[PDB]
Amino acid sequence: LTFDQLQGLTYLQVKGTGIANTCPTLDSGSSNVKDLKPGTYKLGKFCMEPTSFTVKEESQFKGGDAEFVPTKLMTRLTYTLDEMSGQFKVDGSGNVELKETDGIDYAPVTVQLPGGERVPFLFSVKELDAKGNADGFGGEFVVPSYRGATFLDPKGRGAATGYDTAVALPAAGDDEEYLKENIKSAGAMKGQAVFSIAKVDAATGEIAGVFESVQPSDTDLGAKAPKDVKITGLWYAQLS
Amino acid sequence: GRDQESTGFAWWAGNARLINLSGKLLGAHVAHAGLIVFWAGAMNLFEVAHFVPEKPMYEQGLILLPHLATLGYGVGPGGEVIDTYPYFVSGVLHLISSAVLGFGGVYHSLVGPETLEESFPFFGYVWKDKNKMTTILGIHLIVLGLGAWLLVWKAMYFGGIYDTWAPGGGDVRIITNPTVSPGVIFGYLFRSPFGGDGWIVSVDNMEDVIGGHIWIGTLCIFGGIWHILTKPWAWARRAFVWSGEAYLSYSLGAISIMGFTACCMAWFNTTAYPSEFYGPTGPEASQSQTFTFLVRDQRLGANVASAQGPTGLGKYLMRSPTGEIIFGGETMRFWDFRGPWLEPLRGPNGLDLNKLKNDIQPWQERRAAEYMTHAPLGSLNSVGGVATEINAVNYVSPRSWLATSHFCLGFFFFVGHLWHAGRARAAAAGFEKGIDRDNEPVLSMRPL
Amino acid sequence: AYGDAARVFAGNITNKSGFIPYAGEGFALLIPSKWNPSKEQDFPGVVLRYEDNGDAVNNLVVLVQKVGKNNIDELGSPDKFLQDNAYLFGESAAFTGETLSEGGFLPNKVAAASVLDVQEATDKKGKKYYKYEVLTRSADGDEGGRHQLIAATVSNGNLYLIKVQCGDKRWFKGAKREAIGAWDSFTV
Amino acid sequence: IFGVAFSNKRWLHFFMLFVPVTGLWMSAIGVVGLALNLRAYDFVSQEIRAAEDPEFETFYTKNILLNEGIRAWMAAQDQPHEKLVFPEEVLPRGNAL
Amino acid sequence: LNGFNFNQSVVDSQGRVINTWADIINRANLGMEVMHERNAHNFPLDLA
Amino acid sequence: XXXXXXXXXXXXXXXXXXXXXXXXXMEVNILGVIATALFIIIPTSFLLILYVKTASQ
Amino acid sequence: NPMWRQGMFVLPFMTRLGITQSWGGWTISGETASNPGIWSYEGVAAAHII
Amino acid sequence: FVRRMPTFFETFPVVLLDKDGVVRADVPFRRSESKYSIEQVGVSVTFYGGELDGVTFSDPATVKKYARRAQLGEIFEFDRATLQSDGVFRTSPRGWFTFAH
Amino acid sequence: LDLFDDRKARQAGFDIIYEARDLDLPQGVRDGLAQARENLDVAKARIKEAEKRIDADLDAYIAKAYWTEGRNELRRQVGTLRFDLNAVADTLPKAAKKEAQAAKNEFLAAVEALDLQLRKKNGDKAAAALADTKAKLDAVIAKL
Amino acid sequence: MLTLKIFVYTVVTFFVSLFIFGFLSNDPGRNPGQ
Ligand SMILES: CCCCCCCCCCCCCCCCCC(=O)OC[C@H](CO[C@@H]1O[C@H](CO[C@H]2O[C@H](CO)[C@H](O)[C@H](O)[C@H]2O)[C@H](O)[C@H](O)[C@H]1O)OC(=O)CCCCCCCCCCCCCCCCC
Ligand code: CLA
Ligand code: CLA
Ligand code: CLA
Ligand code: CLA
Ligand SMILES: CC1=C(/C=C/C(C)=C/C=C/C(C)=C/C=C/C=C(C)/C=C/C=C(C)/C=C/C2=C(C)CCCC2(C)C)C(C)(C)CCC1
Ligand SMILES: CC1=C(/C=C/C(C)=C/C=C/C(C)=C\C=C/C=C(C)/C=C/C=C(C)/C=C/C2=C(C)CCCC2(C)C)C(C)(C)CCC1
Ligand code: OEX
Ligand SMILES: [Cl-]
Ligand SMILES: [Cl-]
Known part of the structure; x- marks a missing residue:
């Protein structure tokens, strides 16, 4: 649905349908990004609706394939970043600079790999500063830890709150066997995203396109090795 | 009266001696009607006498005055109580009417004829008379239809009804275009009772409430006329026990459903049970808490939009499993909640971040702050708060009293269905007094 | 054998103000009735500590510290004095890791104190009090933050300070009256 | 209705006596164990497992907390x-509530 | 509509609270309340 | 203390002993205990059921 | 690490006739499963049980 | 002095007390706004006699480690690899005899 | 603990939530109704602000077919309009009080009719209702 | 999933219809009394 079509609906006509987890479609407009006046713009209603989640799996078949195996979603329609705002810089030559500041810009997503492995990840574009031409402008964003520093594991252990040992074992606690799990870290990561401006409507100041984002998955608060998650989808924004 | 010697019913089943005594049975039902009217008047005067304007209705343990308030009596914009005289006259009118009702019940029970059949053929009846029973059913079905029309007459022609969703703030509003479309009416009746649907509890505007009571008033009048001019058909005569105790069990089952429905109405509905009078619902208080802290934390400086909680989900805002932007935390379960204070800040996609960031009015903040401190949590001795609270506040929500009491009544009246229906079939078949030793049915049956 | 008859048909409660007067050494305050005397010493120079029976978060502490000054302004401006005494609200020394997932906090930060009020109130006798209200919020969100009413004044070269900590869920439930009452009652 | 029924009335009443008595006697054996702190407090296999991966969660581990x-x-x-x-900071408590 | 809450019901003449067996029960309730669902609450009141 | 942890092992041996010089033999299937127990009890019970039935007539 | 190195006895016989996919999403060849359907390793096991 | 764990507790908070019995340090559960953590107090462990003699530790991680061991009484070294010991305490023949009889 | 400055937070209503939860204060103070009646200028300002929303914001929503926003604008920041009109009308003398109340009821029926049309998404009828709503609102403000 | 829903709807309706018309089939008369 276009943005105006979405506003015509009421909350009771949208609730439970799935439209709320979709980015607006930019119809009319044109493809030449030169229709935008060269200058600075206030990014608004910036949405990123994924269309595919894939996870890089190490190939036991040798050859270092590390292909992105398809996944199945476990967490339902809770995975589209929306209402993001920031700054959009467009040049005379077509150079594009997108810098996001706030909004949703993160959403916990869990997918299941062939074999029963649930791989959670914090799908985010926090502090995304993408620079490039309108065909391929991309950048690097921040991936905060999937769990916060006050998250308590099932044994009460945590980074900023909780025990620092396996209290359950009053003698075997603090052993090098459990030391790794006893110590929990909530450091952040970084990921790479590439965007493209497929269509632009200068009349309404609305741009749309596709994106591809590769970011690490959850590390279990430092207790697990991350995986690469590739997210592809469509993005929408309103320049103003 | 009677005795066990001439009846076979002990004193603890004494009212069972009135089954075939039409006149005395009439007095009993008229007397208990006087008791119901008496309580309504007595409690109305009690609640008025114990009412102080310094506190809202839901803090003073009133359950009848909120009903009168919702009918648009003695209330102004925003739910403020402006006058108490309409509540007083309502209480007196019931209290006096109970006296004449009690006299008829006392007369028809002690002095009046024991049976109405011989002296008053119009009122006389025998339970097995399927025709006469439907006429009595038909007549009392019409008076129910007229009662339903009184509600729509008041909401459309006599002052109006209190609309908590009214534009410009909740106030007494005259309904002019009730929703009478069949699709809307059938939509409520046949939607699931589960979350998001809520069956008829989910009626969310007074146009639907009045439009619904137009259908009920019209159906009852037509159903009353139909059940007067007809008698049960062949398929009905072979599908029901035609005895007095059987008719009682039919109502006990039906009244049991109504008790459960009332329990869920008082707990969830915010349209026919405005939170200005009944207090916040369970979901409302939970949503109010996250709203209150979001407002405070934004003022203390925080992008509530991108604030991440300890679990990785949004601390203040997240997405519902269908995509709507909802408040975060354990309140995620109550994302279906719709209130007159949070709806203005809700676009077609859910909560509006821009509205939540720049356009939150102080009356909305005041409403949410009050609701979170008057959550329905409370104790039996009326100590407000969670079980780990201290004796500081004397408060239990009227919704908590209404939901709990009318669930207990609803369940016991379901056992009434089970009891009075199992006995009706057994009494009619003829083995409610025990197994006959001469011909035990199992002995005739072949061994298992 | 005390011999005192029970107060049958008495009619008047002995104390129903909610505060029990306390006369310390050089200071006086109105300790809330429902608070028990604690036996822990959180900070240097603690001479009095009471905590609520219900929640141990609700507590008050009077701190005397020799400082060799006369007036509290010599200890700095009210802004400077609070910053010098940031140990009053606690510290995050144990947590040394980095984190960006604490929504509503600066990077690598799990606690934050928001100064709501500063006042240089003067006593009836002309005693300069630096009174402060601060809402400390943590990543765990315990109690929904802690209101910490602090009033300090220096007499005879000793700094007399009172810190009344009240949990937020208790603050808007009614504990505010007791907290503010003890804070205002503090007199040196 | 239930598939099995009493056919001996004497056996029915002895059973009505055996169930309650045997139940209380078994409890009394357990309390004797608790007198010496010989308690069935934990499953070591699940506690060892939970200490090794911070993902393993069961209702038993939730009760231990x-x-x-x-x-x-x-x-x-x-x-x-x-x-x-015990100062406040040393008492175990979860986030917020 | 919870059970009887007798916390801080007995108070002495000067306003001090004299604990009862109900208050010891409350301390156990406080232990369970703060530990149940550790990572599920963001706000102090357990309304849900 | 890991120096003292391995000090005792190289020094005087640890506890719980073992039958003779060494009888751990952890390679032993251990499932053979269940195999031997089941192969004994199950046929033994079968024979005892028939004999007691026979001896009583 | 094929089937025959793991002591699998009835797995080769299911695979010999055409069963190659599991409800777990994996295939015996190593590729990813494509809607295994009823006749998986788990499905055939459940069928012989029923 | 570390407050020793009473026999009724499966798990006991570790708290260090001075000679008069006042809490001076502990391993806090909430590390966000602690006021007694051994890092703020600068607690150190010195061992007299036994395997570790004269050895002192100042890093908080090892001080916390031995403080937890201290609340269980005297600090011994245990071989947990020979028998693959799980790490939970067990009963003496005195305890088993009393329960059985 | 790191220290932050939030003295300005008290201004712009930090204590509004804490004022609304003080069961020691009357309900009128807690709900803010008493303060509006205390200073009519506060209520009179809200009436003026309400008029701006109806006269400016509602027109674009109907023209652009933003039905939900049109109804929300009719209940957000206007949710006190009924109270504010009542508070100002009471201060007027009795002779003018009946006139102000009569004018208000005409406007209240007008805004309710406008809200009904936005519910039905009838753009042509909603535009006509908005014109009547704006006209009747000016009549009420003149009399107050 | 739709095929599943239709299958379940057919099954639920079948058993409920048996229940409804089972009790409409002179059930009160299905008793050993005289
Ligand atoms: C031994 C005797 C046993 C007795 C058992 C009795 C239990 C009592 C309950 C039901 C049975 C009695 C008969 C029906 C009574 C009415 C139940 C009802 O009005 O139902 C709805 C109510 C309330 O629903 C709530 O309705 C609410 C409506 O509020 C909305 O609208 C409101 C009004 O504006 C407010 O605006 C509010 O903010 C807004 O959210 C919300 O939508 C909630 O999400 C929604 O849960 O209770 C519910 O939720 C019920 C949830 C479904 C039932 C529970 C599962 C049972 C499953 C059985 C098998 C599965 C399916 C078959 C079932 C039925 C087949 C016909
Ligand atoms: C409007 C509903 C209704 C009506 C008209 C009747 C009518 C009748 N019932 Mg019935 N019954 C009902 C509902 C109803 N019942 C419900 C809801 C239940 C489930 C509890 C029962 C269970 C029941 C039983 C078990 C029996 C009857 C019997 C009878 C017959 C004689 C009863 C009598 O003499 O009373 C006598 C009145 C008393 C003895 C007073 C005792 C009442 C209780 C103990 C006290 C209630 C007060 C207390 C505060 C309630 C708390 C409720 C709260 C917990 C929610 C009579 C025709 C008897 C019968 O079968 O006759 C053939 C009989 O055995 N009823
Ligand atoms: C709503 C409650 C209610 C009502 C309306 C009735 C009504 C009736 N019962 Mg009944 N009953 C009840 C509860 C009730 N019962 C309960 C809880 C029990 C269990 C203890 C019984 C057990 C019972 C038995 C065993 C019998 C009845 C019988 C009767 C009938 C005749 C009574 C009679 O004539 O004797 C006369 C009674 C009196 C003379 C007492 C005088 C007291 C008066 C009537 C009360 C008036 C007080 C009031 C303040 C005055 C109002 C006046 C007004 C103008 C202001 C009658 C219709 C009898 C019957 O079946 O009839 C065949 C009978 O056998 N009941
Ligand atoms: C001790 C017994 C007891 C008591 C004290 C109550 C008390 C109450 N019940 Mg309850 N109930 C009970 C037993 C009881 N009930 C039992 C046993 C059941 C069956 C299980 C129910 C089922 C039940 C339901 C379904 C509901 C209640 C409800 C209520 C509340 C409102 C009552 C009401 O308005 O009804 C009705 C009022 C009348 C019958 C008199 C008015 C009738 C006319 C037609 C009204 C017209 C007014 C008109 C518009 C005025 C304008 C006039 C003109 C200008 C047009 C009230 C506090 C309601 C509630 O609050 O839900 C929680 C409700 O929904 N009860
Ligand atoms: C309290 C009110 C009441 C009562 C006690 C009865 C009782 C009875 N009715 Mg009656 N009826 C009523 C109201 C009532 N009716 C109204 C208001 C109407 C107008 C619509 C009718 C129209 C009506 C007709 C046409 C017939 C009866 C018949 C009967 C008898 C057969 C009972 C039966 O099998 O129903 C059991 C119900 C079913 C087997 C089907 C279940 C359907 C229910 C309603 C669930 C559907 C829910 C949904 C919301 C309903 C949509 C209806 C729509 C208009 C909103 C019985 C004695 C029959 C009879 O004997 O003729 C004389 C007959 O054919 N009634
Ligand atoms: C049958 C019978 C029974 C029952 C009975 C009944 C149930 C009755 C009822 C009755 C009734 C139901 C009665 C009522 C009455 C009432 C009245 C008589 C009223 C009066 C009023 C007045 C006197 C006045 C008042 C006032 C006013 C005017 C206003 C305010 C103030 C006042 C309140 C003062 C019984 C069980 C016993 C058994 C036996 C039989
Ligand atoms: C007012 C209003 C409304 C509503 C309306 C209506 C219209 C209702 C109706 C309803 C109906 C209309 C119905 C209901 C119910 C029914 C039922 C519940 C049924 C019953 C029956 C049965 C259950 C059966 C029985 C029998 C048979 C015959 C079969 C077999 C078996 C037997 C025999 C038993 C609305 C919501 C809109 C809104 C709000 C208000
Ligand atoms: O989920 Mn089961 O437990 Ca009923 O409270 Mn709220 O939620 Mn959760 O917390 Mn508490
Ligand atoms: Cl929460
Ligand atoms: Cl838990």
């Missing part, structure tokens, strides 16, 4: 002879 709260928050007043002066 509940017992930690009961012991710490109750001991100071329930056992005044121990003279426990």
